[PDB]
Amino acid sequence: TLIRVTPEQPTHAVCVLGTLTQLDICSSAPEDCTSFSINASPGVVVDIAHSSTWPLDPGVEVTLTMKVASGSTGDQKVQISYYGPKTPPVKALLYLTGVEISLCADITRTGKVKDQRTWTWGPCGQGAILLVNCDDSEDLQDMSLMTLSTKTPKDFFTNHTLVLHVARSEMDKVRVFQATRKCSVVLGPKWPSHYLMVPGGKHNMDFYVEALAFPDTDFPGLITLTISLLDTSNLELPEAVVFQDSVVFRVAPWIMTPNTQPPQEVYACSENEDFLKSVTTLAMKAKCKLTICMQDEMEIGYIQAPHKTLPVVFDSPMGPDFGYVISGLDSFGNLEVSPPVTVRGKEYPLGRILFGDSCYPSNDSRQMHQALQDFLSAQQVQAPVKLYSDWLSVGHVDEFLSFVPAPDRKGFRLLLASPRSCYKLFQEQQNEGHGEALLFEGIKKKKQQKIKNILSNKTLREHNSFVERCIDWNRELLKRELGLAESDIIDIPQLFKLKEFSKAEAFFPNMVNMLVLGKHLGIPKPFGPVINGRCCLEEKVCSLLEPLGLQCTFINDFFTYHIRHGEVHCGTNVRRKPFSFKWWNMVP
Amino acid sequence: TLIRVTPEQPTHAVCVLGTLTQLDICSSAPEDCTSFSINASPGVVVDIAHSSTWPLDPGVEVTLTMKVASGSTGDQKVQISYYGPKTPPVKALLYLTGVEISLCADITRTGKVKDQRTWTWGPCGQGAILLVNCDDSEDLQDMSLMTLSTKTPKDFFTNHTLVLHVARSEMDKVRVFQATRKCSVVLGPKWPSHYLMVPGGKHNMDFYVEALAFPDTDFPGLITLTISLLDTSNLELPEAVVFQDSVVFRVAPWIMTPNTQPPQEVYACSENEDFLKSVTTLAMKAKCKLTICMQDEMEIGYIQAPHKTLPVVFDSPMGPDFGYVISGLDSFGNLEVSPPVTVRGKEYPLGRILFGDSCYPSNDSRQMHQALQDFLSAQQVQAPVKLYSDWLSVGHVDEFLSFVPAPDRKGFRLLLASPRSCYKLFQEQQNEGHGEALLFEGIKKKKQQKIKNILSNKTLREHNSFVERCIDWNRELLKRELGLAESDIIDIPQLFKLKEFSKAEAFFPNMVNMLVLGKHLGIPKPFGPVINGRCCLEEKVCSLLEPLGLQCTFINDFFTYHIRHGEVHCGTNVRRKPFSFKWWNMVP
Ligand SMILES: Cc1c(-c2cc3ccccc3n2Cc2ccc(F)cc2)nc2cc(C(=O)N3CCC[C@@H](N)C3)ccn12
Ligand SMILES: Cc1c(-c2cc3ccccc3n2Cc2ccc(F)cc2)nc2cc(C(=O)N3CCC[C@@H](N)C3)ccn12
């Protein structure tokens, strides 16, 4: 893309509109002559940087611009006169053929097709987004548009030829279809390059692009597609590259919705009892859709481009929504996301994903499978945070933490399970004489217990006092990585037993692990000591939550054992409104 | 690491120096009382943020600091008085044991052991560097020092215990030895955690750390080592984490030395003839060491930490230096690095690595193995640049480009092979009547050729005219990615034949692919047409280079065919001075 002119022969060149072209005016000059000048046909725009006159100084820098594409091979002309003290002007002729080759996608991020060949984050960055095909004129409504607009002479592709191509390293992560009034595969796995059939004149060409893989440990998540122009005139010699333009795509990451995000649909596909009633009552009250046909073993996120926002469900290691993609800590039981937070400056507008882990890796210690941890980080926009959960028998963060919408402060509360909270309440009672009150009243199969005989236990007080620490550790972890003050955290009274290998389960139905449908909470009925005909525990949950403006509804049968994989399981799940904020306008 | 005080019992806590500790003054308070005050023993430093008085407002934020470590369990005391309108002061006692746990490496990057747990690039970033063990009290001179300084009561580790640990994801990329006046493996592959034997009082402990893997596609190149403090007092319950500190290490990348870098040793281990003489003459003249015992199939780089700079030789897919680590484009023939460049602002002080590739991937097209391309990028500091070389039969960038030191401008010249340069010279001659001059004079086995009969060839003029394009394409690629002006580029006259499958070899010994020893150039003797007893070609090389102050010495037998892997091969190699500039002070 530098042109060398000889006064010997006339040189012919092609010129893509929008390309600074340098002129070697010097290499083949006569030394009889000292200086030169540059006349050109009206449609060409010479810019000499150091009528007119100039010295033959090799330091001078003549550049060519073409205004409009040619209608004819060589219909624009550049003449170099080489004159000097007494050595008449020698001419050197350049016949230019201008052509428009512009390859475009939605780099502006506005659902209309319009910088560098680099993808930039944020409100003023450039880069088209690609959604993952998660298994025409309706299928193409998910795929991203990319058009090749070309103006050239009728004759042009007689001895020129375009080829679209993708790095053999990215071909298996993209598929490209060429539209035809009706589509066909040009690029994808096993095909990294394609020769285009393009006619002369003004022809624009529509391609539809889907991604095949999410970002991950082996894919930073960019697919560059390049158009190359090739000279095929010398018939015996191989193709000569004249020109390359490209578009960088960024594959949209998988994003999760916190409980603070308004609900859109509740899934209760889970046997059943009067639970389904108390759910449909809270679903009606929540002005939210309810369905029936496990929920604990999968998580409904979304993927988002300017042109489409689609719900995608990630299934933990089937007729629900539309879009799908071993340790006890590999479950999505062990996967929450915070609400939008800011932390010491850095901003996290789609929140931060939280997942349970150990403190340090021993031979008696469990972690989430590295493969998952890396995948979540790959998505970048929800900077995962590693919490301590291995102390629990099951090992899930949803066992001791939750979020609920608040009106004031940061517009949310962190709910942490709290043995102390429950103890201070249980004894405050003994002091008022209700020490005789029986926890587990109205229960088919459970040995009932009095406040007194629970408080008077020394073995329990410690077990719970140890759990206090385990949570109080995550309390700080959360306070730091989500940038929280105590005035953002609410302690829900909750006790624990330590079963096999000193591991922890909730002592009574785990009230923190609730159903948030905006301001309408489905809390697991603790079935606790009743005092003056009101479950002491229900009272304190409602006293900590109703002030926030949250409708607390305690539901029986909230969890359930099963036969195979035998495990306690929540039966509900909630598709929620995707963030207004566009993932591609943040800055990791 | 929040402490809750009850007026019921006295609470005991440990406190690591340098840790803001929060006091829950409120959860277990009496409601008979309205306000509180905080007296403490001289060595503790309370900071109440909202003698003294304060309201019991849960919004208040009492924080604990300890000055010096304790000599005795609980030798520092905090008392919380809860007083009110007519409700005498109730006390709540806190017995604090202060301890120093500080884990340190060379985070300052100064070869002395002294922010966050994050590695930062540049002149004011923090992060210790780790060199790769590339196969005592001399072995440890390569390894990085990390010390655990602890001051505690004599009694302290009776019911506390430290453990050093590395993410199971990074254990196979690090090895950690514990010194003993004498060393042993604490952490590495198959061991992610270690219990430390630490005594009470002031004890500091030396660990030596080596990396086992360079950064690569599956390793961003950081090794975090964490120290955890564990409470082992409750004997029946599991260990409780009280405290964690960590050091992030960055594994030093493999770096290459351009020709602009002063030579330190020449390797001519390569049979031989009078070549070895003409080399030792240029080596003596270059005040540079020469050795004898292939050079084309490996590349001497370096790895660099504050405490050690070591030469490492990367071997392309043996008794030379010290430190080691299929397509025709996988060779290091196809691997140069530019000199230090700046490009449109962005700065590249260790230069940029250049490697040959195709334009677009066809079924008749060769690329460097993705595995290598990714490795070079992994090292980050020399942002690889992809050039067009597949047009050449062998396919190596060193076939058409080189660099040499200059005094002025950017302190270097890009040397590009140039058919035009050679043609303008070859004909300028015919014009002066030496058209009869025979190229390949004094050659045992080669059919000689006259300027006239080379110029009068139409088949050659084109072949060479096609190569011109191929290079003129890299000319622009180089001009853009290395940010160059024509006044940085020198054209060396060089012609080509196109052998099998229209591929290119040098028509005469490839003069651009020379031996740079600072200002002393070993150029391959072109064996070209002699005019007035001086090889026309030698004249023009020297006319383009001697002005720069470069001593041009044309060497016979510079390349050589072999038996197995039968291929043309340069026999020399050059270990060069590593950059003064520290890779860890740049910013990718
Ligand atoms: C022992 C236990 C309890 C609980 C303690 C208890 C005591 C008596 C009666 C019911 C009791 N119940 C209710 C229940 C219901 C039916 C049944 F057969 C088993 C458990 N409540 C929870 C909640 C959780 C929790 O939060 N998770 C469930 C596991 C998967 C995690 N992802 C989420 C974990 C353990 N729990
Ligand atoms: C055909 C050729 C020539 C050349 C052309 C030529 C013509 C006549 C005589 C000698 C000639 N010679 C000299 C030579 C020497 C001995 C021998 F048996 C083969 C080639 N000179 C080069 C230099 C290069 C080059 O730059 N490379 C070598 C390959 C590996 C690359 N990494 C670097 C490549 C091909 N060449």
Numbering used by the authors:
A (entry chain A), B (entry chain A): 5 to 54, 65 to 128, 135 to 155, 173 to 218, 224 to 312, 315 to 337, 348 to 371, 385 to 392, ...
Paper text:
Protein arginine deiminases (PAD) 4 is an enzyme that catalyzes citrullination of protein and its role in autoimmune diseases has been established through clinical genetics and gene knock out studies in mice. Citrullination is a form of protein post-translational modification characterized by the conversion of positively charged peptidyl-arginine to neutral peptidyl-citrulline, thus modifying the charge, epitopes, and function of proteins. PAD4 has critical enzymatic role of promoting chromatin decondensation and neutrophil extracellular traps (NETs) formation that is associated with a number of immune-mediated pathological conditions.
Here, we present a non-covalent PAD4 inhibitor JBI-589 with high PAD4 isoform selectivity and delineated its binding mode at 2.88 Å resolution by X-ray crystallography. JBI-589 was screened against recombinant human PAD4 enzyme in ammonia release assay at 10 semi-log concentrations where it showed dose-dependent inhibition of PAD4 enzymatic activity with a half-maximum inhibitory concentration (IC50) of 0.122 µM. Treatment of human neutrophils and PBMCs with JBI-589 for 24 h at various concentrations resulted in minimal or no changes in the viability of neutrophils and PBMCs up to 10 µM concentration. From thermal shift assay, binding of JBI-589 to PAD4 was assessed where, in the presence of JBI-589 melting temperature (Tm) of PAD4 increased by 7 °C when compared to apo-PAD4.
